[PDB]
Every structure is written in C-alpha cells, then in structure tokens.
Amino acid sequence: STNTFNYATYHTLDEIYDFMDLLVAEHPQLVSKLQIGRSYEGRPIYVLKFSTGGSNRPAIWIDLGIHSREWITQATGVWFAKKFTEDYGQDPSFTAILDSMDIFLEIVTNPDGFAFTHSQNRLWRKTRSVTSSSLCVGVDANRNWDAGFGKAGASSSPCSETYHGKYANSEVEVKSIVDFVKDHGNFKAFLSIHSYSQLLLYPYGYTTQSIPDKTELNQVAKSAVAALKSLYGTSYKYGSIITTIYQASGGSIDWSYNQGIKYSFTFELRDTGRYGFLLPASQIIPTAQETWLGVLTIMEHTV
Ligand SMILES: [Zn+2]
C-alpha cells in the first residue's frame, strides 16, 4: 500500500507507476490516473488528477522529471501525491485549494529517459526519440515547447544535451501535455519541477522582455522561497529564467505563460552542486517537504 511504500529512497519507473495504482485504489474519490499519451518508445504517460468534483474546475498543472536524471523530482512527485491524499480534509489551506481547484500531477514526464537512467545511463536527461541521420538519440524536452523555439538558448545539434528537436512539440512527451492543457482549457497555474540549483523561476527564458505580471509573480516566488526556507533553512534564489540562469528557449513555463496561464513557475530543487543530480536519498523527504510549502504557497496565490 502507499502506507508501506518507502518515500525515502529512489524508485524505478514500474515502482512509481505501481505507487500510482495503489494510490488510486486507496483514494478513489480523490485521485484518478489519466493516460495523456505514450512516450516515444511506447510507455504510457500518466497524469494523476486530484479533484473533489466540479466540472473543468480551475486547475494546477505540475510536471516532474521532464529531465530524467533529476531523480529528486520524480521522488518529490511521489511524496506530493501521497501528501495530497493525506492532507485533504486535514489541512485547512490545502483542503481549501482542492475544494475549488483540481491538481494534475505528472510525476514522470519523461518515462523513456527515466528507465534509461536506471538501465543504461544515470545521467541521461533527454527523451529517447531517434533522430534521423544522427548517431544520437533524444531531445531536451524542456527546449521543445512553442516558446521562442529554436532560438538561442537551445541547440540544433542532435547529440547536444540541449537539442530542441526538429520543430516545437516534436516530442510526444511534450505534445501530450500541450494537447491536454489546451483541451482542458482551464489551467491557472503550471509548475515545472527540475533539479538542481535551488531556484524558483518565472518567465521568460527565451527573451529579456519582462512579463507583464512580473511584480506579482516575483512577490509570489519571493513568498514561496521564504516558505520553503522556513523548514530547513534551504536558500533559494528567484527571478526570471533569463536573468537568473541565462537564455533558454522552448521552455515549458514560457509556453504556458504565453497560453495565459499566469502562475507559471519552474522549480530547480536541491542541491546547489555538491551532489548535483545524484542527490542522496536521505535528502528526498526534507526536499519534498520544503518544496511542498513553496508549491502550496504558489497554489494559495492562485485560488
Ligand atoms: Zn531539468
């Protein structure tokens, strides 16, 4: 059961998918599992929908693990999923959130890369799409979105870790989210979880022009990182993608903000580079916990 599940260790693709089935079984009135597409290599892409009803309620999107090696994110997603089911009807603010909003949680946004990080290459980041006329595989899925696509901040070299693919939304993992979000039509927040560097970022990555909503999103980020910090003292920086970590094109929150999803943020979780992507399992739960406060803080500014 999800009560027996070990949240303080890293899991396989199958173990996470299994976790999802266990959670849906234990909480049929709160969580359901949607398949929004398949991965390049044919794995199902699963989004957990947390909802107390209504129809097409204003929604919060959270993608984790779009970069497969950032294992702290998938691990955080699993923890989040469990916590949603624990806190509804217990926590005032979260109960409040779930009463008015749906949450869509994609724990493994890049299943093919995730399996590859377990079977072949722990540090694999990209999808696993086959590039015609190349010896290399995979696209940086967070450079595949239709926001400044192909512009500086991503690579046209197929062997590059930042290769953006042949055209925006070329990756099924990405098109799947796009089609889902577009069809849903009522997303108010869109959260992309990554590691590492301890950043909370708002758009844009692809351009120096400030977003109209900068003052608000900046305050929200400031609030979020402060809430996150209160737990363990973890220090995050926040700002636009391009002023905080330089130009990046084809990014997810740049796309979503441009769809009118105002509350678009990207988290870069622990740490700052000591362990990097190989963050120790013993940090999974504390990271999850502090990140939760930050996320919850953002959801509150959305309701
Ligand atoms: Zn990443």
Side-chain angles (χ1 to χ4, degrees), residues 223-246:
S223 281
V225 317
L228 187 156
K229 185 179 179 53
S230 76
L231 247 198
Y232 297 118
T234 301
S235 290
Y236 267 60
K237 293 157 181 197
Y238 59 94
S240 66
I241 289 166
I242 190 165
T243 61
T244 310
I245 65 179
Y246 164 82

PDB file of all heavy atoms in Angstrom, residues 223-246:
ATOM      1  N   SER A 223       7.537  34.887  -1.806  1.00  0.00           N
ATOM      2  CA  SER A 223       6.755  34.233  -0.752  1.00  0.00           C
ATOM      3  C   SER A 223       7.052  32.749  -0.682  1.00  0.00           C
ATOM      4  O   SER A 223       7.238  32.188   0.406  1.00  0.00           O
ATOM      5  CB  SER A 223       5.253  34.392  -1.022  1.00  0.00           C
ATOM      6  OG  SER A 223       4.789  35.674  -0.632  1.00  0.00           O
ATOM      7  N   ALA A 224       7.047  32.108  -1.847  1.00  0.00           N
ATOM      8  CA  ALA A 224       7.244  30.671  -1.938  1.00  0.00           C
ATOM      9  C   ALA A 224       8.606  30.253  -1.398  1.00  0.00           C
ATOM     10  O   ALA A 224       8.683  29.370  -0.533  1.00  0.00           O
ATOM     11  CB  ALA A 224       7.060  30.184  -3.376  1.00  0.00           C
ATOM     12  N   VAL A 225       9.676  30.889  -1.880  1.00  0.00           N
ATOM     13  CA  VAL A 225      11.010  30.537  -1.414  1.00  0.00           C
ATOM     14  C   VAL A 225      11.149  30.794   0.091  1.00  0.00           C
ATOM     15  O   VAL A 225      11.860  30.058   0.786  1.00  0.00           O
ATOM     16  CB  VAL A 225      12.174  31.247  -2.187  1.00  0.00           C
ATOM     17  CG1 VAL A 225      11.935  31.260  -3.707  1.00  0.00           C
ATOM     18  CG2 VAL A 225      12.419  32.640  -1.652  1.00  0.00           C
ATOM     19  N   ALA A 226      10.482  31.827   0.601  1.00  0.00           N
ATOM     20  CA  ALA A 226      10.557  32.107   2.041  1.00  0.00           C
ATOM     21  C   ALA A 226       9.868  31.003   2.840  1.00  0.00           C
ATOM     22  O   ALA A 226      10.340  30.599   3.908  1.00  0.00           O
ATOM     23  CB  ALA A 226       9.952  33.467   2.368  1.00  0.00           C
ATOM     24  N   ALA A 227       8.746  30.514   2.328  1.00  0.00           N
ATOM     25  CA  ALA A 227       8.035  29.421   2.979  1.00  0.00           C
ATOM     26  C   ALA A 227       8.894  28.158   2.923  1.00  0.00           C
ATOM     27  O   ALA A 227       9.045  27.444   3.910  1.00  0.00           O
ATOM     28  CB  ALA A 227       6.687  29.196   2.305  1.00  0.00           C
ATOM     29  N   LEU A 228       9.462  27.889   1.755  1.00  0.00           N
ATOM     30  CA  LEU A 228      10.341  26.739   1.581  1.00  0.00           C
ATOM     31  C   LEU A 228      11.505  26.803   2.582  1.00  0.00           C
ATOM     32  O   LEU A 228      11.759  25.850   3.317  1.00  0.00           O
ATOM     33  CB  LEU A 228      10.855  26.741   0.143  1.00  0.00           C
ATOM     34  CG  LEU A 228      11.677  25.605  -0.432  1.00  0.00           C
ATOM     35  CD1 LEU A 228      11.519  25.623  -1.965  1.00  0.00           C
ATOM     36  CD2 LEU A 228      13.105  25.829  -0.024  1.00  0.00           C
ATOM     37  N   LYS A 229      12.191  27.941   2.614  1.00  0.00           N
ATOM     38  CA  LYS A 229      13.320  28.159   3.521  1.00  0.00           C
ATOM     39  C   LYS A 229      12.988  27.917   5.005  1.00  0.00           C
ATOM     40  O   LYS A 229      13.820  27.428   5.754  1.00  0.00           O
ATOM     41  CB  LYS A 229      13.866  29.578   3.319  1.00  0.00           C
ATOM     42  CG  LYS A 229      15.137  29.925   4.110  1.00  0.00           C
ATOM     43  CD  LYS A 229      15.565  31.366   3.790  1.00  0.00           C
ATOM     44  CE  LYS A 229      16.801  31.784   4.568  1.00  0.00           C
ATOM     45  NZ  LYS A 229      17.912  30.813   4.384  1.00  0.00           N
ATOM     46  N   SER A 230      11.780  28.253   5.432  1.00  0.00           N
ATOM     47  CA  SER A 230      11.443  28.179   6.861  1.00  0.00           C
ATOM     48  C   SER A 230      11.646  26.789   7.467  1.00  0.00           C
ATOM     49  O   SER A 230      11.884  26.666   8.676  1.00  0.00           O
ATOM     50  CB  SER A 230      10.011  28.652   7.114  1.00  0.00           C
ATOM     51  OG  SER A 230       9.072  27.663   6.722  1.00  0.00           O
ATOM     52  N   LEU A 231      11.558  25.745   6.643  1.00  0.00           N
ATOM     53  CA  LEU A 231      11.669  24.371   7.148  1.00  0.00           C
ATOM     54  C   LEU A 231      13.062  23.993   7.615  1.00  0.00           C
ATOM     55  O   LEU A 231      13.251  23.622   8.765  1.00  0.00           O
ATOM     56  CB  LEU A 231      11.214  23.342   6.105  1.00  0.00           C
ATOM     57  CG  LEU A 231       9.942  22.561   6.426  1.00  0.00           C
ATOM     58  CD1 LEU A 231       9.862  21.307   5.559  1.00  0.00           C
ATOM     59  CD2 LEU A 231       9.884  22.190   7.908  1.00  0.00           C
ATOM     60  N   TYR A 232      14.029  24.066   6.706  1.00  0.00           N
ATOM     61  CA  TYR A 232      15.356  23.527   6.951  1.00  0.00           C
ATOM     62  C   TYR A 232      16.432  24.582   6.753  1.00  0.00           C
ATOM     63  O   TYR A 232      17.621  24.308   6.933  1.00  0.00           O
ATOM     64  CB  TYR A 232      15.619  22.330   6.021  1.00  0.00           C
ATOM     65  CG  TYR A 232      14.681  21.184   6.278  1.00  0.00           C
ATOM     66  CD1 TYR A 232      13.800  20.737   5.304  1.00  0.00           C
ATOM     67  CD2 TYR A 232      14.667  20.561   7.515  1.00  0.00           C
ATOM     68  CE1 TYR A 232      12.925  19.694   5.563  1.00  0.00           C
ATOM     69  CE2 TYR A 232      13.802  19.527   7.783  1.00  0.00           C
ATOM     70  CZ  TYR A 232      12.935  19.094   6.810  1.00  0.00           C
ATOM     71  OH  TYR A 232      12.088  18.057   7.117  1.00  0.00           O
ATOM     72  N   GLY A 233      16.010  25.779   6.366  1.00  0.00           N
ATOM     73  CA  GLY A 233      16.937  26.874   6.099  1.00  0.00           C
ATOM     74  C   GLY A 233      17.444  26.890   4.672  1.00  0.00           C
ATOM     75  O   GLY A 233      18.385  27.612   4.362  1.00  0.00           O
ATOM     76  N   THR A 234      16.819  26.098   3.797  1.00  0.00           N
ATOM     77  CA  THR A 234      17.274  25.977   2.416  1.00  0.00           C
ATOM     78  C   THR A 234      17.086  27.288   1.674  1.00  0.00           C
ATOM     79  O   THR A 234      15.978  27.824   1.612  1.00  0.00           O
ATOM     80  CB  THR A 234      16.517  24.863   1.669  1.00  0.00           C
ATOM     81  OG1 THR A 234      16.712  23.620   2.346  1.00  0.00           O
ATOM     82  CG2 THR A 234      17.005  24.735   0.222  1.00  0.00           C
ATOM     83  N   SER A 235      18.177  27.788   1.096  1.00  0.00           N
ATOM     84  CA  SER A 235      18.188  29.084   0.445  1.00  0.00           C
ATOM     85  C   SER A 235      17.984  28.975  -1.059  1.00  0.00           C
ATOM     86  O   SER A 235      18.784  28.355  -1.754  1.00  0.00           O
ATOM     87  CB  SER A 235      19.500  29.813   0.747  1.00  0.00           C
ATOM     88  OG  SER A 235      19.541  30.198   2.109  1.00  0.00           O
ATOM     89  N   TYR A 236      16.914  29.579  -1.559  1.00  0.00           N
ATOM     90  CA  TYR A 236      16.650  29.584  -2.992  1.00  0.00           C
ATOM     91  C   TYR A 236      16.807  30.994  -3.526  1.00  0.00           C
ATOM     92  O   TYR A 236      16.528  31.955  -2.815  1.00  0.00           O
ATOM     93  CB  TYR A 236      15.201  29.176  -3.256  1.00  0.00           C
ATOM     94  CG  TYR A 236      14.929  27.712  -3.512  1.00  0.00           C
ATOM     95  CD1 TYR A 236      15.239  26.742  -2.564  1.00  0.00           C
ATOM     96  CD2 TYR A 236      14.296  27.309  -4.691  1.00  0.00           C
ATOM     97  CE1 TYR A 236      14.951  25.400  -2.799  1.00  0.00           C
ATOM     98  CE2 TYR A 236      14.008  25.991  -4.932  1.00  0.00           C
ATOM     99  CZ  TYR A 236      14.339  25.039  -3.984  1.00  0.00           C
ATOM    100  OH  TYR A 236      14.038  23.729  -4.230  1.00  0.00           O
ATOM    101  N   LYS A 237      17.218  31.127  -4.784  1.00  0.00           N
ATOM    102  CA  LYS A 237      17.146  32.411  -5.455  1.00  0.00           C
ATOM    103  C   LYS A 237      15.912  32.364  -6.339  1.00  0.00           C
ATOM    104  O   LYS A 237      15.392  31.286  -6.624  1.00  0.00           O
ATOM    105  CB  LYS A 237      18.408  32.689  -6.275  1.00  0.00           C
ATOM    106  CG  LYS A 237      19.674  32.896  -5.440  1.00  0.00           C
ATOM    107  CD  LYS A 237      20.927  32.609  -6.262  1.00  0.00           C
ATOM    108  CE  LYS A 237      22.197  32.782  -5.437  1.00  0.00           C
ATOM    109  NZ  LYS A 237      23.322  32.878  -6.541  1.00  0.00           N
ATOM    110  N   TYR A 238      15.421  33.521  -6.758  1.00  0.00           N
ATOM    111  CA  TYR A 238      14.237  33.554  -7.615  1.00  0.00           C
ATOM    112  C   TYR A 238      14.361  34.735  -8.542  1.00  0.00           C
ATOM    113  O   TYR A 238      15.083  35.684  -8.245  1.00  0.00           O
ATOM    114  CB  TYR A 238      12.955  33.649  -6.787  1.00  0.00           C
ATOM    115  CG  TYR A 238      12.913  34.865  -5.905  1.00  0.00           C
ATOM    116  CD1 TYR A 238      12.304  36.027  -6.341  1.00  0.00           C
ATOM    117  CD2 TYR A 238      13.496  34.855  -4.641  1.00  0.00           C
ATOM    118  CE1 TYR A 238      12.271  37.154  -5.552  1.00  0.00           C
ATOM    119  CE2 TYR A 238      13.463  35.988  -3.828  1.00  0.00           C
ATOM    120  CZ  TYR A 238      12.848  37.136  -4.301  1.00  0.00           C
ATOM    121  OH  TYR A 238      12.793  38.276  -3.537  1.00  0.00           O
ATOM    122  N   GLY A 239      13.672  34.662  -9.670  1.00  0.00           N
ATOM    123  CA  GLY A 239      13.753  35.691 -10.694  1.00  0.00           C
ATOM    124  C   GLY A 239      13.318  35.051 -11.986  1.00  0.00           C
ATOM    125  O   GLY A 239      12.937  33.891 -11.994  1.00  0.00           O
ATOM    126  N   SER A 240      13.377  35.797 -13.084  1.00  0.00           N
ATOM    127  CA  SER A 240      13.073  35.225 -14.380  1.00  0.00           C
ATOM    128  C   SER A 240      14.133  34.216 -14.743  1.00  0.00           C
ATOM    129  O   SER A 240      15.250  34.244 -14.225  1.00  0.00           O
ATOM    130  CB  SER A 240      13.000  36.307 -15.466  1.00  0.00           C
ATOM    131  OG  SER A 240      14.267  36.918 -15.687  1.00  0.00           O
ATOM    132  N   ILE A 241      13.784  33.315 -15.647  1.00  0.00           N
ATOM    133  CA  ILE A 241      14.739  32.326 -16.107  1.00  0.00           C
ATOM    134  C   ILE A 241      15.947  33.026 -16.704  1.00  0.00           C
ATOM    135  O   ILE A 241      17.086  32.739 -16.346  1.00  0.00           O
ATOM    136  CB  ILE A 241      14.104  31.380 -17.143  1.00  0.00           C
ATOM    137  CG1 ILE A 241      13.093  30.451 -16.450  1.00  0.00           C
ATOM    138  CG2 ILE A 241      15.190  30.597 -17.897  1.00  0.00           C
ATOM    139  CD1 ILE A 241      12.166  29.714 -17.404  1.00  0.00           C
ATOM    140  N   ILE A 242      15.706  33.959 -17.606  1.00  0.00           N
ATOM    141  CA  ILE A 242      16.805  34.560 -18.347  1.00  0.00           C
ATOM    142  C   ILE A 242      17.732  35.457 -17.514  1.00  0.00           C
ATOM    143  O   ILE A 242      18.901  35.590 -17.835  1.00  0.00           O
ATOM    144  CB  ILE A 242      16.310  35.336 -19.563  1.00  0.00           C
ATOM    145  CG1 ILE A 242      17.502  35.719 -20.434  1.00  0.00           C
ATOM    146  CG2 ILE A 242      15.540  36.544 -19.127  1.00  0.00           C
ATOM    147  CD1 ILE A 242      17.115  36.173 -21.811  1.00  0.00           C
ATOM    148  N   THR A 243      17.227  36.082 -16.458  1.00  0.00           N
ATOM    149  CA  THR A 243      18.094  36.899 -15.617  1.00  0.00           C
ATOM    150  C   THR A 243      18.747  36.069 -14.516  1.00  0.00           C
ATOM    151  O   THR A 243      19.756  36.478 -13.950  1.00  0.00           O
ATOM    152  CB  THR A 243      17.336  38.063 -14.953  1.00  0.00           C
ATOM    153  OG1 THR A 243      16.297  37.529 -14.125  1.00  0.00           O
ATOM    154  CG2 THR A 243      16.739  38.992 -16.009  1.00  0.00           C
ATOM    155  N   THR A 244      18.175  34.908 -14.211  1.00  0.00           N
ATOM    156  CA  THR A 244      18.692  34.085 -13.130  1.00  0.00           C
ATOM    157  C   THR A 244      19.663  33.002 -13.614  1.00  0.00           C
ATOM    158  O   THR A 244      20.653  32.724 -12.943  1.00  0.00           O
ATOM    159  CB  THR A 244      17.562  33.451 -12.312  1.00  0.00           C
ATOM    160  OG1 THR A 244      16.633  34.472 -11.938  1.00  0.00           O
ATOM    161  CG2 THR A 244      18.115  32.788 -11.061  1.00  0.00           C
ATOM    162  N   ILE A 245      19.392  32.415 -14.781  1.00  0.00           N
ATOM    163  CA  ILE A 245      20.244  31.341 -15.323  1.00  0.00           C
ATOM    164  C   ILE A 245      20.529  31.485 -16.823  1.00  0.00           C
ATOM    165  O   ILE A 245      20.964  30.541 -17.478  1.00  0.00           O
ATOM    166  CB  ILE A 245      19.616  29.952 -15.074  1.00  0.00           C
ATOM    167  CG1 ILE A 245      18.306  29.818 -15.848  1.00  0.00           C
ATOM    168  CG2 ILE A 245      19.346  29.749 -13.603  1.00  0.00           C
ATOM    169  CD1 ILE A 245      17.637  28.476 -15.680  1.00  0.00           C
ATOM    170  N   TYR A 246      20.273  32.663 -17.375  1.00  0.00           N
ATOM    171  CA  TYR A 246      20.594  32.909 -18.779  1.00  0.00           C
ATOM    172  C   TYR A 246      19.540  32.381 -19.753  1.00  0.00           C
ATOM    173  O   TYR A 246      18.572  31.731 -19.368  1.00  0.00           O
ATOM    174  CB  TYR A 246      22.037  32.516 -19.156  1.00  0.00           C
ATOM    175  CG  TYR A 246      22.339  32.384 -20.643  1.00  0.00           C
ATOM    176  CD1 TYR A 246      22.632  33.516 -21.426  1.00  0.00           C
ATOM    177  CD2 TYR A 246      22.331  31.121 -21.272  1.00  0.00           C
ATOM    178  CE1 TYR A 246      22.900  33.394 -22.810  1.00  0.00           C
ATOM    179  CE2 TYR A 246      22.592  30.988 -22.651  1.00  0.00           C
ATOM    180  CZ  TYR A 246      22.883  32.125 -23.412  1.00  0.00           C
ATOM    181  OH  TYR A 246      23.148  31.996 -24.766  1.00  0.00           O
TER     182      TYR A 246
END
